[PDB]
Amino acid sequence: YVKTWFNQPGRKLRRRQARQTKAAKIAPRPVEAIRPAVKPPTIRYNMKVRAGRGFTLEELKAAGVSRRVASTIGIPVDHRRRNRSEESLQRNVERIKVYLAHLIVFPRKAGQPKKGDATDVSGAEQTDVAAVLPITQEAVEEAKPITEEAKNFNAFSTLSNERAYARYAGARAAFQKKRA
């Protein structure tokens, strides 16, 4: 059994046409939805930022948009993800805020901009999200002045201590519980 790749240009052309057909069908709105900024879950990749599946309920509520209408206006919602730190919270919150600020909603039934809509909608144009919302990387630290207490601070001497504390943590954990 062998799997040959003689249809690689054909697959590439078909995917491009499918993207083109998708764009033509839903032209008023961007062809890619808004995605949250999310950090990979490992020690090898926790220094980067990538695109998550969707926002969380806490982020949606903090931004002020309900989880019901969020799907309608094009904001994917993830019910599994949870925010364990405010740093991620206001990070995804400001992603939604800039999305909403740049967002224009065509009024339904074309009678009046009922509450949340756009008065002038003639400026419709299909633009990708990445241009308006360019996902970034972790902020690289710029040059800072020398810190004196850090200068006195050795470095890995500490990592040796808390390491030895960690390895023999059960050793003294026993010691206290047995003598108490």
Partner: protein
Amino acid sequence: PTHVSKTRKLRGHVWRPTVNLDRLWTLLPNEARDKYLGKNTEVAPVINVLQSGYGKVLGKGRLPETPVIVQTRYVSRRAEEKIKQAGGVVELIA
């Protein structure tokens, strides 16, 4: 190419990557080296080997006397006071 083979004449014949301090200044761009190396500035340049893809920094090479802050998870034993004798400090990143 079959034509240049041997049978055409046989016819009928039957995770923790590491970096040494010699390469620490290489990580900073050319602009940072030009605007911080070899001169005396109150603010010191910072090197983040973690953002460059390095887990630990090891101790092979020398350094110019320009102070520099090294952000890393693990640091080598006498590489620390290699920074300190060079005038910089290793500030450990989490």
